[PDB]
Amino acid sequence: VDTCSLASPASVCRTKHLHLRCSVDFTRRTLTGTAALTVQSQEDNLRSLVLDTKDLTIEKVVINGQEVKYALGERQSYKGSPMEISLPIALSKNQEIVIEISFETSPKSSALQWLTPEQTSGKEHPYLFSQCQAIHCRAILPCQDTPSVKLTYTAEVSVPKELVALMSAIRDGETPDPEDPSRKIYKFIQKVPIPCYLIALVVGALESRQIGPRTLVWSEKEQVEKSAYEFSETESMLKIAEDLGGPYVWGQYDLLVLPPSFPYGGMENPCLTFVTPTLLAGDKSLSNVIAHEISHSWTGNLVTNKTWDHFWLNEGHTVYLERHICGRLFGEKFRHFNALGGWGELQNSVKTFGETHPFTKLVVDLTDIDPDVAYSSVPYEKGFALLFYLEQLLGGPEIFLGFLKAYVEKFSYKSITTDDWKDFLYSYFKDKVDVLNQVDWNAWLYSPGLPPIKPNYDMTLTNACIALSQRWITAKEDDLNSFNATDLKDLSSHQLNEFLAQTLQRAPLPLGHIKRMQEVYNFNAINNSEIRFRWLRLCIQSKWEDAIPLALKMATEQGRMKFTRPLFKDLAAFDKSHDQAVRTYQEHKASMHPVTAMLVGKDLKV
Ligand SMILES: NCc1ccc(-c2cccs2)cc1
Ligand SMILES: [Yb+3]
Ligand SMILES: [Zn+2]
């Protein structure tokens, strides 16, 4: 059972379909309308059921054309309030009914960010975007807010006529609103059953450009051309992903490039992946994030974690496929380089949390834990590390990719646990059970800290990064002169990034060294967000006051939590910038993403 949801479990009843009919009110910052849930009983004599909600105003509940009794329970912190609905007629097993709920969201909905015109590129129109993963769908509409339940959906969304609505679904047409000629209704259909965390909505001044046979890029006009170029590898990655995972079942693969406050690198919303504009490096260098979102079209969206305790299933397999796509595009040596970088990121997380911390377990227990607080690189990189280790144990990438395809096939349209996965691994590799029995399952799955075994990694592309990092770390003042721009001559942006990641692991460095680095390498000039991020962290941790306004600027001018949280934490930990860090958060907090605002607040202890 799902300890993050207050709703009736799938063993009691199952939502089959949602029909959403709503209107987006920018003046009140509310979504208002009806959620018609088609619900199937899994039980004899079913007379009531419970749905998740969060900061919702319920107007009424209609079944068979009549209003019915319902009750909202006490709020249970981040989980919201359970909504019990009294059914007018007892249902037998497998009977289906339609429950129509009239509702309105709160302006403070944790699923939503409402932006004013000034927070947009165009400066003329406001903008709304949603982010339901993990348990924020309940903050938009009453539902069984659990990925153990999969449903199809259709929607009609009324918005001001000069704006465009898009959803995680196939666009099903647009018309003027019959009830308000200042408005348009956009329609949508998602024919593939999905967990509700994949329900997504954006409303804004969006334009589009085609970039492949099944891909449009959407953004405000100011970002269209840059995005089109940045993400032009999309079709090639789709074709590789299809070869590894099987048929792409979703119809279109569109991309939406959000305003800078989008809290993640990407969100695998079906038909319409959302991405941060921090990917717009100008050279396609951050395209692994596209490869990752693409991969989710199989691992996560087809095969889904049953509860959030098993999130590593989603993320581990996705990073595994992601790195295969990039290895196919750029070479096996590059896949190894990225894999080893991933291990470094895992070292960082474990170090940050502490090696005995419960969140460093692969499988976690989220009872009384807000998933947003628990979120880290761990399920991503410990999950990937397990798969990469198993790959090497079981005969290599070709063999293990056979397993991954059979795994996707086996569990498509289903929600599964770690035991489901492990059971199938044993079934698939039944001629290799002796080898599988060598794995320390208890440690890998259930123990905190770094994995019991580290995989083997080709070092070719990593060597120069480590070598240069070591030069700087071991350098004394009289060695600083020997550093020069030519040190970077043969390094890719990826290698520059890894050089910085290596050095950041030993931070602080002497202030004079960092000053010299800027002198000879001019890292302040680099706009690649991954590079600039690590460089600013290195500067602040090394107590360079000059970097304070740069770090403050990056932390606030975009809101990708990966960057904003550690930049804020670094700034707070530096005595010279502490007060300004706190003041800056205080001033920006009301106009930040609500989840980001909450977490930075916790991070800063304000
Ligand atoms: N992106 C929302 C989010 C999704 C998953 C999780 C976790 C599941 C298990 C450990 S963290 C946390 C936050
Ligand atoms: Yb010396
Ligand atoms: Zn992911």
UniProtKB/Swiss-Prot annotation:
- Consequence of mutating residue 268 to A/D? Complete loss of epoxide hydrolase activity and aminopeptidase activity
One GO CC term, this protein: extracellular region
In its keyword annotation, does this UniProt entry include Metal-binding?
yes
GO molecular-function annotation terms? aminopeptidase activity; epoxide hydrolase activity; leukotriene-A4 hydrolase activity; metalloaminopeptidase activity; peptidase activity; RNA binding; tripeptide aminopeptidase activity; zinc ion binding
Mutating residue 268 to Q leads to what result?
A: Loss of LTA4 hydrolase activity, and aminopeptidase activity strongly impaired
Q: What residues bind Zn(2+), as annotated? A: 292, 296, 315
What's the effect of swapping residue 267 to L? No loss of activity
Instruction: Name the needed cofactors.
Output: Zn(2+)
Using the record's annotations, give every residue carrying the modification Phosphoserine.
412
Consequence the record notes for mutating residue 562 to R: No effect on epoxide hydrolase and aminopeptidase activity
Which tissues is this chain's protein expressed in? Isoform 1 and isoform 2 are expressed in monocytes, lymphocytes, neutrophils, reticulocytes, platelets and fibroblasts.
Q: Which residues carry this modification: N6-acetyllysine?
A: 69, 333, 410, 569
Pathway info: Lipid metabolism; leukotriene B4 biosynthesis
| Role summary | Bifunctional zinc metalloenzyme that comprises both epoxide hydrolase (EH) and aminopeptidase activities. Acts as an epoxide hydrolase to catalyze the conversion of LTA4 to the pro-inflammatory mediator leukotriene B4 (LTB4). Also has aminopeptidase activity, with high affinity for N-terminal arginines of various synthetic tripeptides.
> Subunit comment for this entry?
Monomer.
In Swiss-Prot or TrEMBL terms, this protein is called Leukotriene A-4 hydrolase
